[PDB]
Amino acid sequence: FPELKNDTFLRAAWGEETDYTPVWCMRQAGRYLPEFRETRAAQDFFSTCRSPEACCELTLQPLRRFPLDAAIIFSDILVVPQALGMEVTMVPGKGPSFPEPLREEQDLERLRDPEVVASELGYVFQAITLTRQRLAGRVPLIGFAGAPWTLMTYMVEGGGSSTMAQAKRWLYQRPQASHQLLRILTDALVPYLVGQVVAGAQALQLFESHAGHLGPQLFNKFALPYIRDVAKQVKARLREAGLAPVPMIIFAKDGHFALEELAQAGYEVVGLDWTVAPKKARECVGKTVTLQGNLDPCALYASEEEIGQLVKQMLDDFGPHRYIANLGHGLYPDMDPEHVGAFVDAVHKHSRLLRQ
Amino acid sequence: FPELKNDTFLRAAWGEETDYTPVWCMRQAGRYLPEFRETRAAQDFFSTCRSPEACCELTLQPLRRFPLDAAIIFSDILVVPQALGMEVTMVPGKGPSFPEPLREEQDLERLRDPEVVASELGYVFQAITLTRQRLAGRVPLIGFAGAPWTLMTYMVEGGGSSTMAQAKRWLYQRPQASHQLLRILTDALVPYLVGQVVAGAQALQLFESHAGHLGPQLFNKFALPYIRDVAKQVKARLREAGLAPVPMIIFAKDGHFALEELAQAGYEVVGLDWTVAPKKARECVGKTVTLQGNLDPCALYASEEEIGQLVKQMLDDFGPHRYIANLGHGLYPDMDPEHVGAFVDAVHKHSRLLRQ
Ligand SMILES: Cc1c2[nH]c(c1CCC(=O)O)Cc1[nH]c(c(CCC(=O)O)c1C)Cc1[nH]c(c(CCC(=O)O)c1C)Cc1[nH]c(c(C)c1CCC(=O)O)C2
Ligand SMILES: Cc1c2[nH]c(c1CCC(=O)O)Cc1[nH]c(c(CCC(=O)O)c1C)Cc1[nH]c(c(CCC(=O)O)c1C)Cc1[nH]c(c(C)c1CCC(=O)O)C2
Q: Is the CB of A144 under 6 A from ligand 1?
């Protein structure tokens, strides 16, 4: 692959001093871009995910507009449950659905052996290699997957939920079957993540997007052990294969209560939502790990000048060390690309003033 | 297995009132689908049939496109003569061939004892169990086999034929050897069909695709007795094994002359080709059995609007009771998947208007 030209994101993830604060945006390849919607109109969502050229184009689109310090591959967390044998659809205006969710323990019988999942996800690896080549070293490419608990919630709920009542009912009423499922997911995730690195990913982010529904007790029993196992096993397999381990990011949305534990779970970077004050987060996690985040995505509805002041304040609170700027969640479909530009530019401008 | 969610097909097969007319399509897993051709490119035809995962994938493909009310397992009728010890190939662009067909009575000596055939077809049962699990109760799964006479025609002709002259020459010149062969086939078919149900099939279709070459006299002597024996013996063995018998469908293509007899042969459903007017078929078969069919597959070359009108007319002629919609034969390789979608949608839409 082409030599990396701008490695600021990686240096920051590993905890090194940089000349400025690197920035990227969750969902930067997304519906807020008119050109995303155009390229997406040609096929259905999961079909787009299976086309290396389409995924590469979507990944590059934001970089053509903004000097972001990282690219994230276009894919979806739900490719893993699909590869395990569950049917998944994208419903117009209503998002992902599994028409036949897991509701009893016997439903685990229809899943594939997790060791065969990476072979079913060859299309993602093709997308990653292509995108890594076409990026031509401009910035690093991030691979990703969903965390075991978050994937479990989709598999049991059959889609999004405001309470995760059915998935939590599995934790309380079916604890053994829940651990069985979480282990199947972990065992599928590890070879998939390793495969993403072999294919060219230079960093990995694990999305625990449904962390906040669990309190500390359930999170410690059912989410954390698997988050830890994913990082430990990925690094081990990469070492055994003769490859350089990559920095790994854990993002647990609404996971304020788990920050201390997440900073000791074997991830270089802990991603934060917008509800945690940066100074308090720095207290919980300590001085080694790098923090990523955490601007309220809705702040991008403010004027460009107001976005600038909000960024200044955020950066002052995090400080220049051990920090990658991002939003606290993904960009929303109705946001203005110019305001996204204003966010990127302000991070770069103020972080330089905070150093020089 | 997972609880069945949409049982409309089964209720219709058993003669019960439903909210709408269920529809499926012969050869719905077929070459008209670009994705079928892709998954089929990886192996030879009979090798595909021996891979449970490949058969499951092919079975599910049409369901991802269309809300069909049944799935039919991907396999072939010719697995039975192969399991009896005959070598069979799939010839590019020319279809199935037996390079050493049965031509004299002494050729029966190389066949296996029919009681061992089900043990040779374990791969089909594996495909069925897997597909039943992965369908996750969405719709019922249909198993199938060729009828004795139709299988005999392939074994003697060595492939397709426009006249069945060699196979009919056996009926007239070698009647005893013909009955011997037909009995061997029946005795192989019964344990195979029973095995398909044990493995998870929820209905069975027997394809008498070469019925029309026989007139009434030959059909009554050489095809009908074996069609009757298959249904009687399958139901008996299922009862003896403690299992629920499934609805059985007999499809005798170009079998206009046998409809009355076929309705008294122990099958819940009689499938019809497109040359029989639905109202005349209802007259021959009477008021108990369910009819399945019968749209000219070539009608799918018409525009989507024209397909809608043809479906309306077909459904008006059959009436809402005792009816499962299908084509009058399998889908052809050059048909447009969108037009197949139009057929499925029109059945559902008009059959609801014909009730409410
Ligand atoms: C709507 C939706 C999708 N996929 C998903 C949903 C939410 C369902 C719900 O809970 O109701 C599932 C999903 N996909 C992803 C997550 C992680 C947490 C989150 O960001 O919401 C989750 C929870 C990462 C992603 N999903 C996607 C990426 C790729 C990176 C990128 O596109 O920039 C990632 C990491 C791509 C994606 N995936 C989808 C779209 C529309 C896009 C484009 C981005 C946008 O406009 O939202 C479909
Ligand atoms: C070409 C052919 C095949 N197999 C056969 C032929 C015809 C030979 C001739 O008389 O010249 C033999 C066969 N296989 C089947 C039948 C029943 C009658 C008929 O449908 O023609 C017959 C007569 C059922 C089937 N054959 C198949 C199924 C599985 C159900 C499904 O695939 O949807 C069934 C019930 C699968 C099959 N089998 C084959 C293909 C290409 C496919 C995919 C479907 C397509 O594009 O045609 C090979």
A: yes
Nearest listed ligand to the Cα of residue B68:
2
* Best residue among A27, A61, A207 to mutate for probing ligand 1, ranked by most atoms within 8 Å of CB: A27
Q: In which element (H, E) is residue A96 found? A: strand A95-97
Burial class (CB in 10 A: 0-12, 13-18, 19+), A337: middle
Which experimental method was this entry solved with? X-ray
Number of structural domains chain A divides into: 1
Yes or no: say if A114 and A84 are a contact pair by the CB < 8 Å rule. Answer: yes
**What letter does residue B26 receive in the DSSP assignment?**
T
Q: Is A91 in the pocket of ligand 1 (CB under 6 A)?
A: no
CB atoms within 10 A of CB B85: 13
DSSP string for B79-143:
HHHHHTT---EEETTTEEE-SS---SGGGGGGSPPGGGHHHHTHHHHHHHHHHHHHHTTSSPEEE
* Domain encompassing residue B123: 1-356
Task: Judge contact between A10 and A202, C-beta under 8 A.
Answer: yes
Question: What CATH number did the domain enclosing B291 receive?
Answer: 3.20.20.210
Single out the residue of A191, A118, A180 nearest to residue A155, CA to CA: A180
To one decimal place, what's the resolution in Å?
1.8
Any known ligand binding at A29?
Answer: yes
Q: For residue B95, give the nearest of B76, B111, B117 by alpha carbon.
A: B76
